[PDB]
UniProtKB/Swiss-Prot annotation, chain A:
HAMAP family given in the database record: Ribosomal_eL20
Species of the source: Drosophila melanogaster (Fruit fly)
GO molecular function, one term: structural constituent of ribosome
Gene: RpL18A
Transmembrane portions of the chain: none
Family per similarity comment: Belongs to the eukaryotic ribosomal protein eL20 family.
Upper taxonomic lineage: Eukaryota, Metazoa, Ecdysozoa, Arthropoda, Hexapoda
Name of this protein: Large ribosomal subunit protein eL20
From Swiss-Prot, chain B:
Organism lineage: Eukaryota, Metazoa, Ecdysozoa, Arthropoda, Hexapoda
Gene Ontology terms describing biological process: cytoplasmic translation; negative regulation of translation
UniProt cross-references to PANTHER family, sorted A to Z: LARGE RIBOSOMAL SUBUNIT PROTEIN UL13 (PTHR11545:SF3), RIBOSOMAL PROTEIN L13 (PTHR11545)
A single GO molecular function term of this UniProt record: structural constituent of ribosome
Protein name according to UniProt: Large ribosomal subunit protein uL13
The organism of origin for this protein: Drosophila melanogaster
Gene3D superfamilies linked: 6.10.250.3250, Ribosomal protein L13
UniProtKB/Swiss-Prot annotation, chain E:
CDD domains the record matches: eL14
Alphabetized InterPro entries for the sequence: Rib_uL2_dom2 (IPR014722), Ribosomal_eL14 (IPR039660), Ribosomal_eL14_dom (IPR002784), Translation_prot_SH3-like_sf (IPR008991)
Keyword terms of this UniProt record: Ribonucleoprotein, Ribosomal protein
UniProt source species: Drosophila melanogaster (Fruit fly)
Protein family: Belongs to the eukaryotic ribosomal protein eL14 family.
Name the UniProt record assigns to this protein: Large ribosomal subunit protein eL14
Keyword Protein biosynthesis found: no
Gene from which the chain derives: RpL14
Amino acid sequence: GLLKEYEVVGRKLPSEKEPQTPLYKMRIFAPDNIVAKSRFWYFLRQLKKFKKTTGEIVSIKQVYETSPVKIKNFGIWLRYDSRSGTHNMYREYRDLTVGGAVTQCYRDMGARHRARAHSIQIIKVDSIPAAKTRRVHVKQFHDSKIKFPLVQRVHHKGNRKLFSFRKPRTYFQ
Amino acid sequence: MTGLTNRTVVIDGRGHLLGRLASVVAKYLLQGGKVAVVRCEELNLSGHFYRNKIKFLAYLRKRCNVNPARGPFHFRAPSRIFYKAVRGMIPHKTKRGQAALARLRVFDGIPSPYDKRRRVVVPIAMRVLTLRSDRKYCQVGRLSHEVGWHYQDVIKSLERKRKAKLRVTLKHNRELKKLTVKARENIAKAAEPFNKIIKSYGYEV
Amino acid sequence: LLLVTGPFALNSCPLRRVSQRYVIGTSSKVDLGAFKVPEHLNDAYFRRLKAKKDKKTGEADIFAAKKERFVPNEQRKKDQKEVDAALLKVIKAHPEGKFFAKYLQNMFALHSSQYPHRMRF
Amino acid sequence: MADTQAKSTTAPKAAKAQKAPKAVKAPKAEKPAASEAKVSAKKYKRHGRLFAKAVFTGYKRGLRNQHENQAILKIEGARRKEHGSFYVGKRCVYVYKAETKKCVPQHPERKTRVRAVWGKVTRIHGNTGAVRARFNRNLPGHAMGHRIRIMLYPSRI
Amino acid sequence: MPFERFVQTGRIAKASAGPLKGRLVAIVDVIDQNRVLVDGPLTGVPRQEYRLNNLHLTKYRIKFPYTAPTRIVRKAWTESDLKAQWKVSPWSVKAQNICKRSSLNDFDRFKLRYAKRQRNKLLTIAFNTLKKRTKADGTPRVLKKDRRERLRAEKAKGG
RNA sequence: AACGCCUCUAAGGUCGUAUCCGUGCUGGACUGCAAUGAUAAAUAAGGGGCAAUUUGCAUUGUAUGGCUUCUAAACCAUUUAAAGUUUAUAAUUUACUUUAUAAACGACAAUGGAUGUGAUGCCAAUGUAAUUUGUAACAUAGUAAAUUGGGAGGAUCUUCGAUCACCUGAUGCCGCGCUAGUUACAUAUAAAAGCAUUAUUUAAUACAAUGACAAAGCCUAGAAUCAAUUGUAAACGACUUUU
RNA sequence: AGCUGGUUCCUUCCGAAGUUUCCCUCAGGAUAGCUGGUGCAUUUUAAUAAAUAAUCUUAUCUGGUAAAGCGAA
RNA sequence: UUUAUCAUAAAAUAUAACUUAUAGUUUAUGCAUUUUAACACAGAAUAAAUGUUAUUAAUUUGAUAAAGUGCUGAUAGAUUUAUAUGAUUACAGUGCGUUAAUUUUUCGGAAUUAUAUAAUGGCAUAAUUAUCAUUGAUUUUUGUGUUUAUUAUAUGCACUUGUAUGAUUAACAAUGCGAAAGAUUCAGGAUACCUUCGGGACCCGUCUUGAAACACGGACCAAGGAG
């Protein structure tokens, strides 16, 4: 569930008589180098036949988030499978990570729709520049002059005393 | 009193959730911490007044038909409702569990010597911390009176009487506490046996 | 194994030897340069002069109680008193409390609500 | 940051006293430039020193396999796996009360109305600083929520 | 709005969870509800985003240019003399005290307790005539009133 | 309000069943518990009782190497998640209550053991101890030992409700203790043989309870049940009456 | 009596089948299969492979199910 | 990505003349002051605020792989009939008698450098052979030259509580005690059985697919009693 992004390429077997089968690639969200290949064939199958082990892997390579301190809005376009009911989504996530966005995605999808990690298909990734954010929740973050109340707290339990005689003390002023 | 740590922990049943408190207490009894739980009418259980009322009414439906006096004791009192919650969490069918129940004392409306005693908070049990905002909750003493607890009226008078003795002791305690701090502060600088130990401690007391 | 002295005169602990494992080795250091050193106190020295099974000699059909732990010996007293005296001079430099000079007397307190685990002794 | 951890980790060893290396600060705090390298922990409860106030409140069990040859021992001051790891090695004793003597001269002479069962502490049971213990006898389990007692002999430096 | 604590730009937060732990930090930018971009260059924590569940937010609010990279944060922090206010901060001195409540190699512990009994005598020994309660007395005397004037003045007396 | 609006509803709030649950009605926790009475045995005897006692001595727990403990004062009164703990000035109150101004621990890190919060301990002990320290000075802060009478008050399963306080007045004089600080003088324990000191792992002592041999120090002099008997009672015990 | 009931010490090691066929057979046998025991002949599958047995793969055959078809019989 | 720095867009976050309000208050329904998570990229301007191109920093940051590089704690085990009829052998340390030089301790000693032989890596050169493509690399094999490092051989004999010898637990030490018969003291034990604690234990025989069965025999015990 560990969200690492991987470039996988796969040609379809190698004959000397028979030249240079075409080279397809994908970006794959996987914790796993193996899951990177696993999803890669399944999505490759959807356009272009190519069953592993009439299938040639090629190279498995992990790709490098360009800006993990970078403060960006991503739109992901998503397909999920419901019980009687496969449908399409666009949702927008504000994350450090394209990796972090997807990880927050599988959790969010899982929750609301009952969203199966196996029942979810990714679709597409783009970084949203600039007011193309339909995103009512998202566009709240873009707002000049972003000060926001800290609402509530979170009470470590109890203490370094199991026995807290100094009463928490919901106050905080 | 004499214990692995304190053989009597007087616990304030105020703003504790009933099962959260019962479970942590059950552990303490098994560990040998011998606890007394006071103000079980001030004990809260989550889920609306009405929702609790119907849950609790479901058990009295349970009744050993042949001789119902063999049959399930539907314990009215908030102290006894707390007691049932702890007892179920303990293996009370074993002789070890009998020892553990004997370690436990449960009182509604804090009497005898327990009122000049400090009611300790268990912070896991705390309703305000654990329970989400805007969630309606029931108070056990309200629930108790619906299922037939006679003594709701009785304890409320006994608690008021207790609070009044507890008010006068507080007032004198706060007055005394002023006069103790000045009597340290004024002798402190006036030689050095208070300057030596306080500022060599220098932490933040 | 360890040679340990209280110093004797303060915290009532003799020229006494104890296991490396019995000991928590606290950060507090007394300058050990002044001493006559236990070059002179060796395994043999404190080895007991003697648990005879009885009255010196050789098979005298004896009697209940010699001195398995207790006289005491004069040689051993003299050895303590010299070493302890030099201990007292170094130890007096450090201020009173639990364990160096008038500091030494007191008998240890990790007091109730105090911690053998986060005591970085 | 793997390098930075390595540099940061030289520093507490330096302070200990010695082998004499790295300083690269660490706070013990005034410090001229450090709130840097962190406020303890902590995770407590007490005793500690003849005896950790300890509880025999269990045996090491399967769900319903009693397996008493090792015991669970809760050391009061040990919340954490780190703290209970201090106690890994220590000798334990349970001293308890008897009506009837038994044992005469070898060491002291105990009037054996007071009986002692001697044990050692072993490895760290708890996510929450309970520890395993082996005892030479093994503790009868009538000792449950009875205070058992752990002397700080054997402590490594 | 009385004012409870704002997740604001520059409201500061002393982040408990981290390799940061106990370092004082300032909120650069408000990310998402769960996170804030935080930079504390004078406490020497490098720039990172971190979760608002890892950090709990301070009283201290300094007019901050919100979106500042490390150099301008470091320039704005020593202009605020923020470190110096944070040492005055008596609850941070109390936070530096638990780094000292640690050990105090047991030698220093019985300093407290030997000498606490110096003060513990002197309390009971200062005690017992205001107005409040009553308060009193006209003894029954020659030692007892000369023990009350043995607070006060302290000549001639007993008995 | 959502849905500028509007609406029994989302939040909050009112009335409302032969229901339900008490009141009530019925068994009465076999011994769950309270209150109160007499508290024996009678003298050639002694017996019990206050025994919480007090002594030789014993038993047992505590602390177990003084003590390497411990604590029935004690962080409210709450709606409660912007909910909130307080101080002070100006008012206000029975109520940390009520009002305006200024701040403040802005559910941070803090805090949660101890402020041991009537500032405990492990102190007293100026050698702190399986001995106790004893004895001299200086100056500062400054300590107190005893008895009796009277007037009012308190008690929810609680270790003595024919008990324990508080206050006020009176009586005198054992001067019994003195402590902390600094400093003098002397010494037993401590030298526990052991160089591997933990191993079979202590107890002088301290505190709390219990004991009782012969003896000692105070107080007081029941009834139950069976027989016989009633019928209000009943198979028999038992119930209710009786001399 | 093909039925029911019972059958008398232990340990060690290996260890089933309710299937095939025929039988007035179908509450049972025989028979084959599964089971053990007894061994025997040779170990390049044996005592100080260029000989296999049987499972992948490969190479070389077979098939009318799944699917498909009905503007194919 | 980020630090440090340059140019451009550009200040879209903040700073910044000034414009406005509520309001405590002030002045006299309105004003002036100031405070206000109540105003306006509001002017020039500033921090390049963000984006983009360039340069970087002990080059970061993430991941993964690798070195007995160095090292600590704890846990359980430790058959040892090693001549029942089978091994005790191997190595290492230390001393012995080749020298020199430099260095450290500065005493005893210790290290490195100064040989021949063999192997190996690294440089250059040449041939083959396979390969990615030929700009250039990689592979297997072989030879040659140069220099350097590393490693092994040329290091025997005596002694040794040295390491292992393939289940290598003992140095070292304390304590109980075998104290004549007599008999103390220590350790150890689900004998019978009692106690205290936890956990587990449903009735056997049998036919039956399956038995604790609300299936059948068997109250209990002895002795006869069936491949």
